[PDB]
Design a protein around this ligand. Structure first.
Ligand code: HEC
Ligand code: HEC
Ligand code: HEC
Ligand code: HEC
Ligand SMILES: [Ca+2]
Ligand SMILES: [Ca+2]
Lengths: 317, 317
């Protein structure tokens, strides 16, 4: 089918599982340790914030509130992006100055820990708990200092690699099953490509691979009649093309989390003059199409975190 | 064994499972629905607080920070008590005036919802989500209005009944296995009874059944040399005798969450003039004994919460 043809040229399905990371095989110990860390609020100085707090695995992997402030890169509050399938994103943050985005040498993990705690503090904390000490040795055998920021980061990435959502209808369609998407979804997929959406939203995650000088702003006054995606003040200031997988599960939308309905988000983008102007039917069909991007949500067994000991730092500001 | 004799007269083990609640059998649908609600942050107006936030199932069922404010009964901030085995507690809150505690007609669930949201709001919220609507009908078939505060409360209680921790060593010892507790733990159990601890901390949960006019205060200046448990300003003002099950997992201690070490908490209580003055060995042995109260932690599969719809109220203050 010609439709399946161009689809396959532009998109790729989520693998059933990633087994290697940074050229290293992912062990189960690493996965388990990473899970604990992802849920342990003790990584925050205050002992109340965990990755799961803002990237809630029960609600699409995002907190689903307008904005929050979790990473040091942030110049301000932004909508928390889902953590599902994030491992495939080359472009990680929402926005930034092009020169600075070539200076954000830091990844999400280091960014967050430095913001809500300090690496030294996090190390001292994990070190005071025997169960963690052991878990680290068992997961990183050939290591001098098993409990170190580096390994912690590696462990979390391993768990992150576990949070993928394969087998969404769209993916089944890409893999072959031409019955996966209904007619409306197909008109949508067609319109998505025809209107130039795929110009920016492409690849495995339908986005998350590049930055562009367009961002949502509240109109000076000219949802879909209150906000618009326009050029930034200079092409040096860019926003990441949001990866669309599981988009139906992570409202509100855009970096500021200001539009709550997907139909509006679609209309707004389809009015950004970044392609052929959209027709009502298209907007509807596209939305239907987007729903086909919801994959299989990860089944997570809440980890049992080890108890603090007498040398474990106590909460603070 | 004489020791096992008085032990059995004063204590009782946690049943393997509670199957009935308010004279009604607990179905699995109720359990599942309750689990979702316990983790759904949308029960708070702001969409950021869930029961799990403060009664974290991964860390002993408590948040393990000095204090928090989660229920309307609260006159101030208090340490969040564990939710594990709470269903067996007759006395639910930390403290209060005797006359008012005969007016706290409200339970933890209603107290919390009224504080962080409103019953009407919570009802409107759950009602806007089809998956919940259905889950409610399947869990409460013979019901006029399936989605109602009442049923929500019932569902959560059902899930609460699931959060019990049977088979702690102490319990195995009570059930017979005289090898469950080592010699030190036995000296501890003996001392616990001999020093009058069991006068207040008894029953299935070693506490949580009655109120007494003694509470921790910071000495005017006379941990164990900075705080003390003394009489309240009048026997009308009382504090609940904290249930001790899983106590080794829920530091800090006392209603204000001011003492971090169990040895100190024990010393302080064993100096309250509520029994024979404790000897260093005893304090150590008792602590060892308390550790025998950590039961089997519940294995929880994080629930997949349904997506908000267009009629679902948006976050607020
Ligand atoms: C709320 C206070 C958060 C906490 C705690 C954590 N994260 Fe986060 N994360 C948050 C926001 C608001 C954002 C966007 C920031 C921006 O300006 O871009 C993020 C982003 C990430 C990302 C990048 C997403 C991608 O697709 O590459 C990742 C992967 C991520 N966060 C992971 C994560 C982990 C592992 C955390 C605990 C160590 C962590 N975040 C904490 C907000 C919050
Ligand atoms: C490149 C210039 C783009 C084209 C072509 C389209 N989109 Fe896009 N999209 C782009 C950016 C820079 C952003 C973020 C803007 C911001 O201020 O945050 C987005 C975001 C979306 C979203 C929101 C997803 C989310 O918040 O998780 C949707 C739903 C979306 N885009 C859809 C979409 C459609 C349907 C398009 C063509 C009809 C389209 N976008 C084109 C960049 C680009
Ligand atoms: C933090 C902001 C909390 C949230 C949200 C919830 N709870 Fe809570 N709970 C909290 C505290 C600080 C306390 C002590 C209050 C006091 O003054 O006594 C509690 C207490 C309870 C109890 C009673 C414990 C017992 O053994 O009987 C229960 C059972 C309980 N909380 C349950 C619970 C549920 C089901 C919640 C969500 C609907 C809930 N709490 C929210 C703090 C917090
Ligand atoms: C009845 C008057 C009591 C006697 C006898 C003992 N305890 Fe107790 N205990 C009691 C109260 C009213 C409280 C709460 C005081 C407050 O300000 O919060 C407690 C609490 C404890 C704790 C803390 C548990 C927790 O915070 O989760 C411990 C560890 C404890 N009590 C132990 C203990 C021991 C070992 C006793 C005899 C040697 C003892 N208590 C006696 C009431 C009473
Ligand atoms: Ca979002
Ligand atoms: Ca406590």
């Amino acid at each position: 089918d010609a439709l399946h043809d161009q689809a396959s040229a532009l998109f790729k399905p989520i693998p059933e599982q990633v087994t290697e990371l940074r050229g290293q095989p992912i062990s189960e110990q690493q996965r388990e340790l990473g899970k604990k860390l992802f849920f342990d609020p003790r990584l925050s100085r205050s002992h109340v914030l965990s990755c799961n707090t803002c990237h809630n695995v029960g609600t699409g992997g995002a907190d689903n509130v307008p904005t929050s402030v979790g990473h040091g890169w942030q110049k301000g509050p932004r909508n928390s992006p889902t953590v599902f399938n994030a491992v495939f994103n080359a472009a990680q943050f929402w926005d930034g100055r092009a020169k600075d985005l070539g200076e954000q040498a830091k990844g999400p993990i280091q960014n967050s820990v430095e913001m809500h705690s300090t690496p030294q503090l996090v190390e001292q904390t994990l070190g005071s708990i025997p169960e963690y000490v052991d878990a680290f040795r068992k997961a990183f055998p050939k290591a001098g200092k098993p409990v170190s920021f580096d390994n912690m980061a590696l462990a979390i990435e391993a768990y992150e690699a576990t949070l993928v959502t394969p087998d969404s209808p769209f993916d089944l369609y890409l893999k072959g099953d031409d019955k996966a998407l209904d007619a409306q979804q197909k008109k949508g997929l067609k319109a998505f490509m025809d209107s130039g959406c795929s110009a920016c939203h492409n690849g495995i995650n339908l986005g998350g691979q590049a930055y562009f000088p367009f961002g949502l702003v509240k109109k000076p006054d000219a949802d879909k009649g209150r906000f618009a995606v326009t050029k930034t003040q200079s092409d040096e200031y860019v926003f990441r093309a949001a990866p669309l997988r599981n988009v139906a599960l992570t409202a509100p939308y855009f970096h500021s989390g200001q539009v709550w309905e997907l139909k509006d988000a679609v209309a707004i983008m389809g009015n950004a003059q970044l392609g052929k102007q959209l027709a009502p039917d298209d907007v509807e069909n596209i939305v239907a199409f987007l729903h086909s991007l919801s994959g299989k949500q990860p089944r997570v067994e809440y980890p049992l975190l080890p108890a603090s000991t007498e040398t474990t730092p106590r909460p603070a500001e």
